[PDB]
Amino acid sequence: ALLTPGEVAKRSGVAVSALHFYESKGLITSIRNSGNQRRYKRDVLRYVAIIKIAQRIGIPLATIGEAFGVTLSAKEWKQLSSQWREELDRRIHTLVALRDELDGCIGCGCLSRSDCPLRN
Amino acid sequence: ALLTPGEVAKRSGVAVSALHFYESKGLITSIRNSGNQRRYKRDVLRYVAIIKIAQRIGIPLATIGEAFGVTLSAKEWKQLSSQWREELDRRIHTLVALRDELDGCIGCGCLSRSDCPLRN
Ligand code: FES
Ligand code: FES
C-alpha cells in the first residue's frame, strides 16, 4: 500500500535523494503524516521505473513531466514509450548524420572555417 | 603570429572563458608577457576548432587531451578524426541497440523488474 522513502528506493534501485529530485521536478508525489512522515504509493515504483528508462533513452527530464501530463496501464505506457522511441530515433540519425560529415572530412583535414561541414 | 585571447575567441566562435577552460584541461597553451599579458599562437585556432568538433562528436573532454598526447598536419588529424569517428559509431549502435529494446517492450508494458531488457 504505502511504501517508505527508503523502500521505494531499495526496490527502484535509486537513492532516496533521487526520489526527492523526482519529486521536485514534480514527477512523483508523497503523502505526509504524523510530523510530515512522508510515504509513497505502490504504483510509484512503476513511474520511477519509467523515468529511468526515459532518461536512459535520452529524453530530457523536463519533457518527461510534460508527457507525464497527458493507472499507468500498458495503454498509457504505449504512449510515452512511443513518443520517446520516435525521439530516440531522431537523435540516432543526427549522429549518423554527423558520422557521415566526419567520414568525408577525414581524408581532407582542411578544417576550413569557411567550408567544412563538421565546422557548421 | 600571436593572437590576443579576445582574437582567438572572436575567430574561433567561443568565449574567452572557454579558452581558459580549454587551458585548464591543458588542451591549449599561452605565453605570458609584460605583466602576465597572455597571448596565443596561430595554430591554436586549429586546436579549438578540432576540440569543438570532438565535443560535437561526443568525445569526453578528458579523452581529448589523451589523444592530444600522441604541426597538426592532415596526417595528425587523420588520427584524432578516426579514433573519434570509430567512437561515435560505437555510441550510435548502443542507442540503435536501445531503440530495439524499446521496440520490443512497447507492445508489452509489463516493465517487469525481473525480465524487461529496458530495465537492465
Ligand atoms: S576537414 Fe576539410 S571539409 Fe572538413
Ligand atoms: S515492458 Fe515488458 S519486456 Fe519490457
Question: What CA–CA distance (Å, rounded) separates B26 from B15?
Answer: 17
Exposure pattern of A24-49 as b/e (b: 16+ CB <10 Å)?
eeebbebeeeeeeeebbbeebbbbbb
Among A26, A23, A35, A32, smallest CA distance to A4 is for A32
| Resolution to 1 decimal place, in Å | 3.2
The CA angle B66-B70-B75, to the nearest 5 degrees, is 125
Q: Does B97 touch chain A (CB under 8 A)?
A: no
Please give the full DSSP string across B19-80, using - where no structure is assigned: HHHHHHTTSS-----TTT---EETTHHHHHHHHHHHHHTT--HHHHHHHTT----HHHHHHH
Residues in contact with B3: Cβ distance below 8 Å, sequence separation at least 6, in sequence order: B11, B39, B40, B41, B42, B44, B45
Q: Amino acid identity, residue B9? A: A
Span between the terminal Cα atoms of chain B, in Å:
54
Distances in whole angstroms, Cα of residue A51 to Cα of each of A19, A59, B35, B108: 11, 9, 53, 17
Return the residue matching grid coordinates 602576465: B36
Residue A120 carries which DSSP code? Answer: -
The dihedral through the CA atoms of B62, A87, A28, B114 has a sign that is negative
Which region, left, alpha or beta, applies to residue B13 given φ > 0 means left and ψ of -120 to 50 means alpha?
left
Say how many C-beta atoms besides its own lie within 10 A of residue A81's C-beta: 25
B108 labeled part of a ligand binding site: yes
**Ligand 1, pocket-test mutation among A100, A108, A114, most atoms within 8 A of CB:** A108
Best mutation target, B85, B87, B88, B114, to test chain A (most A CBs within 10 A) = B85
- Residue A20 makes CB contacts below 8 A (sequence gap 6+) with none
Beta bridge mates, B17: none
Helix segments in A1-120, DSSP class H: 5-12, 16-24, 44-56, 61-67, 74-108
Q: How many Cβ atoms are within 10 Å of A8's Cβ, its own excluded?
A: 24
CA dist., res. A4 & res. A41, Å (int): 9
The dihedral built from the CA positions of residue B91, B97, B117 and A78, taken in this order, carries a sign that is positive
Find the CB nearest A85 among B103, B110, B113: B103
DSSP A46-78: HHHHHHHHHHHTT--HHHHHHHTT----HHHHH
The set of protein residues with a Cβ atom below 6 angstroms from ligand 1 is A 105, 108-112, 116, 118
Within chain B, what is the greatest distance between any pair of CA atoms? 69
Question: Which helix (H) or strand (E) element contains residue A1?
Answer: none
Domains of chain A: 1-120 (1.10.1660.10)
Residue B79 has a CB neighbour count (10 Å cut-off) of 12
Q: How far is the CA of A103 from the centre of ligand 1 (A)?
A: 10
Distance from C-alpha of B115 to C-alpha of A67, rounded to nearest angstrom: 25
User: Per the structure block, which three cell numbers stand in for A101?
Assistant: 560529415
Identity of the residue numbered A110? C
Q: How close is the nearest chain A Cα to the Cα of B110, in Å?
A: 7
B14: enclosing H helix or E strand? none
Identify the closest residue of chain B to A117 by CA–CA distance: B53
Do the Cβ atoms of B49 and A114 come closer than 8 Å? no
Atom of ligand 2 nearest to the CA of A77: 1
| d(C-alpha A111, C-alpha A119), whole Å | 7
User: Which residues face A100 on adjacent strands?
Assistant: none
Q: Which technique was the structure solved with, according to the deposited record?
A: X-ray
Cβ contact, residue pair A89, B99, below 8 Å: yes
Element (H, E) at B96: helix B74-108
Query: Can you name the residues that pair with B3 across neighbouring β-strands?
Result: B40
Pocket test for ligand 2, best of B100, B111, B120 (most atoms within 8 A of CB): B111
CA distance B48 to B8: 9
Could you tell me which of B13, B93, B71 has the C-alpha nearest to residue A120?
B13
Q: Taking Cα atoms as reference points, which of B90, B60, B117 lies closest to residue A56? A: B117
**Burial (0-12, 13-18, 19+ Cβ within 10 Å), B52:** middle
Residues sharing a CB contact under 8 Å with residue A62, sequence separation 6 or more, in sequence order: A25
